[PDB]
Design a binder for this molecule. Sequence first.
Ligand code: OYA
Length: 210
Amino acid sequence: MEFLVEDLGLVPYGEAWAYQKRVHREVVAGNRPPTLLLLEHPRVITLGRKATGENLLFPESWYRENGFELYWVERGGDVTYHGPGQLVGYPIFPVGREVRRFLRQIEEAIVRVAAGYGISAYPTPGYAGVWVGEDKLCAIGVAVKEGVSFHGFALNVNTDLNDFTVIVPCGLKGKGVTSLEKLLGRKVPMEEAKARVVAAFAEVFGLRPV
Ligand SMILES: CCCCCCCC=O
């Protein structure tokens, strides 16, 4: 019937990760409703299941020297970047066995958010995440353990898109990355993007937000 939204604001990746795991435990135990965490991270690169050292353009020592944190994680995908101005959403939801369906629902929610801004976005038949033309507006990479999801999505609102140039994803993809700011030619308030994401999730999943 319901999902809980928690706005964590700006939180370091490591502690936010530990929080994800604690939230996940409670949902698995049936002691917390499905939970959508909304937040930002300080500049961080994460390397998922498919990731290798060639997903990094520079040596990894360079990243830490230049203001990035770097972590190896168990989510789908290879490399991604999170940083200020990017709305990171961690839906920690009792999805069961239907992971592909859950991914499609996240995609749909993001497509709805973009539509609210007058932007035509699509999952694309062939590339993970949500795209506007040849550019990726939102990365998506989930993990599921004991039938409950963690990690999630990363919607570019006012992201510093220049920070993506130092990472080199592998596989089938479009040409670039984009943000609501870049597409609209002006910054979009983070509090507003959060509200619209909540509204979109409520609609797609058919749950009332608390
Ligand atoms: C929380 C968003 C994670 C997105 C990871 C997708 C990377 C694709 O290869």
